[PDB]
């Protein structure tokens with residue numbers, strides 16, 4: 001029994017050991033209560049405004065569309081405190097944890113972005129934060145690890161399995177199954193067992209709400225399409241949600257194509273995986289032929305997650321949203337182009353969304369189209385990655 | 396076939412509890428795992444619980460996490476596990492065999508096809524670790540259609556609704572969980588209320604598991620009214636400690652199981 005529907009069509013659900021169901025049911029009840037509580041909403045709105053910096057700008061990018069019939073706006077989540085959209089929902093989940101009387105936060109992280117977001121929300125709201133990170137990811141994300149530690153979070157390397165994100169995920173769940181009476185599991189994307197895909201969407205939906213208001217103010221009509229990268233699905237569903245009922249607005253999610261779909265080295269389970277049951281959910285995932293969970297790949301660590309949120313799989317199945325992929329090389333070109341022609345350094349995650357908008361423009365330059373790209377983060381963190389690749393290829 | 400029912404009737408006739416070891420199929424290799432299982436039976440195991448190596452065993456502590464990796468290091472696949480299961484049943488016609496599965500391995504090539512394969516090799520029960528009773532309908536229906544008992548966890552905090560669901564939906568035995576957290580012999584209380592209400596609701600006989608590592612825990616569980624006890628990590632620790640000595644591994648396994656099985660009389 002649940003208060004809300006745990007499924008999006010065939011996808012989603014609550015596929016956790018029995019011992020964790022009370023924790024999920026408690027969380028769903030607290031969320032439903034909080035969503036009805038004006039004082040909770042006012043507290044959340046106050047943090048978003050006065051601490052995180054909402055509303056974020058909606059920036060028209062004149063130089064990169066010159067000579068075409070594309071009008072391109074960037075929704076500037078790169079300007080949010082922490083430099084990525086993740087801050088929105090960790091503030092809401094931290095307030096939920098407090099509403100439940102929890103004084104400890106568990107979080108998983110692969111690229112270290114959600115780890116930093118969880119750590120900053122925990123520092124602000126006086127929560128003891130512990131972060132599980134696969135030991136391979138600890139090694140290659142030393143800047144984000146140091147940020148988490150500066151913010152007082154305890155970072156715990158995970159050496160089991162493949163020592164990366166899914167293995168940190170397991171360890172977070174193992175911890176929570178014994179500690180949920182005092183700890184809240186602050187899951188980092190719009191995936192996992194119900195109620196998380198729903199909570200994370202609702203705590204990210206101001207991205208699309210603001211975008212709709214801002215584009216109506218500036219253009220007097222809705223976008224032709226909104227475009228967002230998809231690692232787990234949170235920034236994309238945050239942009240999409242308020243447009244789902246505006247059936248003329250295209251919703252385009254961009255998975256990482258890595259070295260190319262045909263190489264198998266990619267992060268595009270929604271279009272090129274197979275439905276499985278893992279991560280607490282029924283969803284497309286990258287897996288072996290006999291059902292072992294596989295390794296994904298992207299130049300962008302924040303997109304390097306071998307499954308996807310169940311609402312995205314559902315919106316695809318009914319045709320409401322379309323999902324595409326963008327390769328490392330395409331994302332790198334979009335990264336360089338935004339820097340040089342708009343003076344904005346985009347996150348390599350977000351560069352995947354930008355690259356697909358650039359393709360939409362360039363393929364059909366006389367097509368009238370009003371596009372919004374969700375610029376989910378800034379790319380200061382990526383400049384060494386981009387430098388090293390550009391140097392190895394002689395640029 | 397009704398192997399749990401025959402075993403429990405026979406144990407009840409002898410005023411005796413079941414002792415049920417858990418091991419990972421193919422840990423540390425296929426040939427040694429077959430010998431391990433034959434030794435556990437030869438030492439007095441009443442039934443078996445057998446894990447199929449999975450990439451992400453999120454309900455398992457370090458000891459069984461490591462067994463999975465040892466099995467993967469030997470190239471063990473689910474297909475090879477089912478070949479092993481068929482041979483085990485062929486050697487041991489009456490011992491109940493239960494699998495401990497993660498959902499994706501069951502769902503992977505079709506839920507119905509998985510339970511059909513269990514029936515064909517002679518498996519008696521399946522516990523899917525990450526399928527709570529609330530999500531269990533397609534799994535328990537496929538199980539029952541193929542004469543497989545679906546096993547459900549009854550956790551410490553079970554409210555009355557969960558007790559009624561577990562009693563109504565489970566077969567073979569009820570897995571009575573001794574605590575929260577994950578598996579491991581490093582972390583160790585059968586409440587008479589759950590055991591009583593399970594009997595009141597005509598549940599399958601209760602086996603206690605998680606942390607069971609000493610003979611007096613086996614006797615404590617039977618005394619509380621459970622029909623027996625399951626021990627996992629404690630057995631797999633013996634495998635881990637004696638990897639370099641295959642023969643000493645079998646002998647220490649023989650002694651521990653005999654000790655635990657004696658505690659249930």
Ligand SMILES: O=C(NCCOP(=O)(O)O)c1ccc(OC(F)(F)F)cc1
Nearest residue numbers: 109110111112113114169188192232279
């Ligand atoms: O992708 C996930 N985490 C986001 C990590 O963000 P980053 O720090 O940028 O890697 C993620 C985490 C948990 C999850 O479900 C479950 F908990 F069950 F495993 C599914 C996806």
Ligand SMILES: O=C(NCCOP(=O)(O)O)c1ccc(OC(F)(F)F)cc1
Nearest residue numbers: 017417454524578579605606626627628
């Ligand atoms: O039987 C099991 N393990 C062996 C005995 O446990 P231990 O003696 O503590 O290793 C066992 C049973 C269930 C399980 O997952 C879940 F609880 F969710 F269903 C994981 C392990």
Ligand SMILES: *Cc1c(COP(=O)(O)O)cnc(C)c1O
Nearest residue numbers: 189231232233234235349376377
């Ligand atoms: C984590 C992250 C993403 C991908 O996560 P989603 O949940 O898919 O949004 C995208 N952009 C940035 C900047 C990120 O940090």
Ligand SMILES: [Cl-]
Nearest residue numbers: 041042044045
């Ligand atoms: Cl609000």
Ligand SMILES: [Cl-]
Nearest residue numbers: 180181182183
């Ligand atoms: Cl408490």
Ligand SMILES: [Cl-]
Nearest residue numbers: 209210212213
């Ligand atoms: Cl409005």
Ligand SMILES: [Cl-]
Nearest residue numbers: 271272273274
């Ligand atoms: Cl496909």
Ligand SMILES: [Cl-]
Nearest residue numbers: 559560563564
């Ligand atoms: Cl019922």
Ligand code: NA
Nearest residue numbers: 231305307308
């Ligand atoms: Na993904």
Ligand code: NA
Nearest residue numbers: 295296297304
């Ligand atoms: Na990867």
